[PDB]
Amino acid sequence: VGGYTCGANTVPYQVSLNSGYHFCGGSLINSQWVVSAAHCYKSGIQVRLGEDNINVVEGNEQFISASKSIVHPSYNSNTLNNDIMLIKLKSAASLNSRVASISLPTSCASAGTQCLISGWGNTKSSGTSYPDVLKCLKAPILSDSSCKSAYPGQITSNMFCAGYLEGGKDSCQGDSGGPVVCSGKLQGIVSWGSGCAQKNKPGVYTKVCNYVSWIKQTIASN
């Protein structure tokens, strides 16, 4: 599987994107904006903050609908290049201990840095808790060299790999759009990859540090 049960609200910037059901994660950036992957775009999104078990109302949730989605202008869905989107909330969230914003990088993270990847539902179900309670995995950023050698021809300047390569700990589709956080900065977004109790195919993440100027200009103008 990989990871473990996080504990409710221990990842306070984690959001669930719901359109009738949970279909993507994302990260709260400030009280009115969320970042997620552009392959998560859809009409009629609601943002669910303060969630642990997404099938039970536990008492700390905020359900706010999305008023505007902005997919990155150069997003390529064939190659998942520039796989990032911004979501504006109809109303601002009440920030508190369990619902918090995550900070944007001022610089890119080095390989070997340690990160926390978060999301619901790898696929599975029974490992420790629920495709319903939030799961966590700590993984090192991999070397550009290893990332590319795992996916020859497919990795761009806007992607990095993390995980363990050799049948270690990964995600599995479920977690798309969720955050990769390292040194208390949002450094990636769960994008794509190839297999979960598999073998040596690391996860592939959007490299948030390349988009900070777009994110701040876009959010300030919208």
From Swiss-Prot:
Pfam families for the chain: Trypsin (PF00089)
- Main subcellular location: secreted
Entry-linked CDD domains? Tryp_SPc
Q: Which portions of this protein are annotated as coiled-coil regions?
A: none
Residues bound to substrate:
170-171, 173-174, 176
Q: Name one GO molecular function term.
A: metal ion binding
Q: Describe the processing and modification events after translation.
A: Subsequent cleavage after Lys-124 leads to alpha-trypsin. Further cleavage after Lys-169 yields pseudotrypsin. A cleavage may also occur after Arg-98.
Q: List the disulfide bonds.
A: 6-136, 24-40, 108-209, 115-182, 147-161, 172-196
BP GO annotations:
digestion; proteolysis
* Binding, Ca(2+): 51, 53, 56, 61
Task: Indicate the family of this protein.
Answer: Belongs to the peptidase S1 family.
Fetch the PANTHER family from UniProt.
RIKEN CDNA 2210010C04 GENE (PTHR24264:SF15), TRYPSIN-RELATED (PTHR24264)
The protein's name is: Serine protease 1
Q: Which organism is it from?
A: Bos taurus (Bovine)
The organism's taxonomy opens as: Eukaryota, Metazoa, Chordata, Craniata, Vertebrata
